[PDB]
């Protein structure tokens, strides 16, 4: 499974 | 970063035998690029463009491949255009037959 | 020892080119492409027959949701980074690479890394539970992400979720990932300007690792020998070529040796007339 990014940079 | 390009067939080639012509461009940035398989100075039909990828060093790469039957009387090449190149660069296939 | 890898990569581009998606997103098991998402299609599709066969609709819909989420955040990231670098327009890219490696089923590596315009930007250091700033412009990202305590969730993904999925995928694709395909090898020669250039080309091998050497007098000869590295075919197999420059008339003194998992003994090949 991919990971949903947790926060923008 | 300029593309590094190789042109090769799926199988070792022979006249009149069905095959696939590949053109692989790698090591480049930015990702925008034009890669075109050519026979006798005309684009080959039926070209397929593999999903763009990049390597562990972040540099981009693209494979283009087309089914073909190589002819002894013809010359095959890959034409590449990229922002790093002032003019299109043509890479010739060696049939090795 | 049984090694396996799961790697996800994604790219957001300001200038993909005419007709092309600005966001592309792919996954690899043991280096073999198995899923693809882009911003035009707005879903993940299979790229191997084993994931197509063994994954159900819930899997695809769940991955699609993640792809859409990541597309949205990377669009935002492109804007954030352009402002941080004081840049308008032009060509820019954000790239991510992350995943896990397992050895005899157990995790041995987990990574999560970003590049901006092709240069390292930030990486997770799972051991210290911090983020590295490769460049000064990444220091605000390090700060934000450390303050937000995201390391715990990322560590859990890399050590648990990623590993559990990689174990499942290796089961789904066990026969395909473990297969061997033998190279078809051809030696070819061309003379020009007083130099005989011999080529040894290996077509259609799997897996990817190979050694192709030119021998003379029984010995591997790297002097004047040049490898093109290992490049892909359309079909999940690989290609390589190695040349060596020789004196005209010396063709019969050279022999190409091919070492590959498919070949119980190395292949040996010479230049025919």
Q: Is the domain C3-178 a CATH 3.30.500.10 member?
A: yes
Query: Which of C35, C80, C98 is nearest residue A9 as measured by Cβ atoms?
Result: C80
Positive or negative, the Cα torsion across B28, C231, C28, C64? positive
Q: Which residues pair with B24 in a beta bridge?
A: B6, B63
The enclosing H or E element of B60 equals: strand B60-68
Q: Tell me the domain boundaries of chain C.
A: 3-178, 184-268
By the 8 A CB rule, do C233 and B22 touch? yes
Question: How many structural domains are present in chain B?
Answer: 1
Whether residue C24 lies within 8 A of chain B, CB to CB, comes out as yes
Q: Diameter of chain A by CA atoms?
A: 22
Structural resolution in Å: 1.7
Chain B nearest C-alpha distance from C144 (Å) = 24
> Which tokens in the block code for residue C193?
């300007």
Beta-carbon separation of C239 and B52 below 8 A: no
Residue B97 within any structural domain of the chain: no
Rounded Cα distance between B65 and B9, Å, is 9
Please list the alpha-helical segments (H only) found in B39-80: none
| C230 inside 8 A of chain B by CB | no
Q: How far is B69 from chain C (nearest CA, A)?
A: 16
Structure token digits, residue C262: 């498919």
In a domain? residue B43: yes
Closest C-alpha to C9, from B57, B26, B17, B94: B57
The third-level CATH classification (topology) of the domain covering C184-268 is Immunoglobulin-like (2.60.40)
Residue of B nearest to C28 (CA): B53
Tell me how far apart the alpha carbons of residues C18 and C92 are, in angstroms, rounded to a whole number.
16
> Considering all CA atoms of chain B, what is the largest pairwise distance in Å, rounded to the nearest integer?
41
Domain span at B26: 4-92
Per-residue burial over C173-212, b if 16 or more Cβ lie within 10 Å, else e, is beebbeeebebebbbbbeeeeeebbbbbbbbbbbbbebeb
Technique of determination: X-ray
Query: Closest by alpha carbon to B51, among C225, C102, C20, C180?
Result: C20
Angstrom distance (rounded) from CA C204 to CA C127: 40
- Chain C residues near any Cβ of chain A (below 8 Å): 8, 25, 27, 35, 62-63, 65-67, 69-70, 73-74, 76-77, 80-81, 98, 112, 114, 121-122, 141, 144-145, 148, 150, 153-154, 157, 161-162, 165
The span from the first CA to the last CA of chain A, in angstroms, equals: 22
The domain that holds B28 is classified in CATH as: 2.60.40.10
Three-state DSSP class for residue C29 = strand
B45 falls within a domain: yes
Q: Using CA atoms in the order C29, C33, C37, C39, what is the torsion angle rounded to 10 degrees?
A: 130
């Amino acid at each position: 499974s991919a990971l949903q990014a947790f926060r923008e940079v | 970063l300029t593309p590094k390009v190789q042109v090769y067939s799926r199988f070792p080639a022979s006249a009149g035998t069905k095959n696939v012509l590949n053109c692989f461009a790698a090591g480049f940035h930015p990702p925008k690029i034009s890669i075109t398989l050519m026979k006798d100075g005309v684009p080959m039909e039926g070209a397929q463009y593999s999903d763009m990828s990049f390597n562990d060093d972040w540099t981009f790469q693209r494979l283009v491949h087309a089914d073909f039957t190589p002819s002894s009387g013809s010359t095959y090449a890959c034409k590449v255009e990229h922002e790093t190149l002032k003019e299109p660069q043509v890479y010739k296939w060696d049939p090795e037959f | 020892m049984e090694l396996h890898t799961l790697r996800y990569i994604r790219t957001a581009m300001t200038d993909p080119g005419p007709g092309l998606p600005w966001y592309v997103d792919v996954g690899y098991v043991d280096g073999e492409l198995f899923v693809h998402y882009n911003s035009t299609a707005r879903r993940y599709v299979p790229r191997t027959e084993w994931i197509a066969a063994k994954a159900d609709q819930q899997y695809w819909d769940g991955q699609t949701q993640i792809g859409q989420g990541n597309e949205q955040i990377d669009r935002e990231n492109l804007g954030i980074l352009q402002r941080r670098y004081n840049q308008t327009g032009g060509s820019h890219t954000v790239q991510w690479m992350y995943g896990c490696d397992i050895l005899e089923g157990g995790p041995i590596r987990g990574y999560y890394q970003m590049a901006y315009d092709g240069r390292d930007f930030t990486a997770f250091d799972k051991g210290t539970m911090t983020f590295t700033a490769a460049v000064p412009e990444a220091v605000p990202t390090k700060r934000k992400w450390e303050e937000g305590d995201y390391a715990e969730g990322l560590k859990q993904y890399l050590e648990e979720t990623c590993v559990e999925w990689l174990r499942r995928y290796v089961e789904y694709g066990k026969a395909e990932l473990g297969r061997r395909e033998r190279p078809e090898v051809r030696v070819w020669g061309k003379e020009a300007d007083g130099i005989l250039t011999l080529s040894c080309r290996a077509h259609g091998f799997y897996p990817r690792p190979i050694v192709v050497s030119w021998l003379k007098d029984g010995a591997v000869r790297g002097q004047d020998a040049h490898s093109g590295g290992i490049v892909p075919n359309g079909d999940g197999t690989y290609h390589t070529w190695v040349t060596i420059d020789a004196q005209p008339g010396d063709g019969d003194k050279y022999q190409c040796r091919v070492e590959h998992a498919s070949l119980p003994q190395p292949g040996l090949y010479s230049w025919e007339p």
